[PDB]
C-alpha cells in the first residue's frame, strides 16, 4: 500500500522543506553524553581487567 | 531605523549596524516564491546603507 500510494504537497521545494524540518533536531547534547558514556565504559573495562 | 543607520556612520569603531536576522528570506528561500523574491528585493536596497 505504501509503494502504491504516495504524494507530495502541491507545491514543494526540498531545500526549504528540509531546512525547516531538520533545524529543531540539532539542539541537544545526547550524542555528546553518549561519547562520554563510551569513554567511561572503556575506562571501566580496562580498570576491571 | 533609517535615522539610526544615518547616525551610526559617526561611530564605526564603536557600534556596527547590521540588518536584522528576521529580514532575510525564511528558511533559505526559493526564487520560486513571490513573497520570497520581494524579501530579497527589500534587503538588497537596504544593505548598502
Amino acid at each position: 500500500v505504501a509503494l502504491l500510494s504516495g504524494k507530495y504537497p502541491p507545491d514543494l521545494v526540498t531545500n526549504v522543506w528540509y531546512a525547516d524540518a531538520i533545524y529543531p533536531m540539532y539542539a541537544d547534547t545526547e550524542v555528546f553524553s553518549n561519547l562520554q558514556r563510551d569513554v567511561i565504559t572503556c575506562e571501566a573495562v580496562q580498570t576491571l581487567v | 531605523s533609517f535615522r539610526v543607520a544615518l547616525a551610526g556612520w559617526l561611530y564605526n569603531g564603536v557600534v556596527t549596524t547590521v540588518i536584522d536576522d528576521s529580514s532575510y528570506p525564511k528558511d533559505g528561500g526559493s526564487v520560486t516564491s513571490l513573497e520570497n523574491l520581494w524579501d530579497f528585493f527589500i534587503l538588497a536596497l537596504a544593505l548598502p546603507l
Partner: peptide, 25 residues
C-alpha cells in the same frame, strides 16, 4: 438593522498565499 444583519450573516457564512509548505504550518 436588516442591512448590517444581512452583512454579518453573509460574512459569517462565507469568510473562513505564495509560500512553500513547511512541517511547522
Amino acid at each position: 438593522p436588516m442591512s448590517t444583519r444581512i452583512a454579518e450573516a453573509t460574512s459569517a457564512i462565507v469568510s473562513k498565499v505564495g509560500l512553500p509548505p513547511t512541517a511547522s504550518s
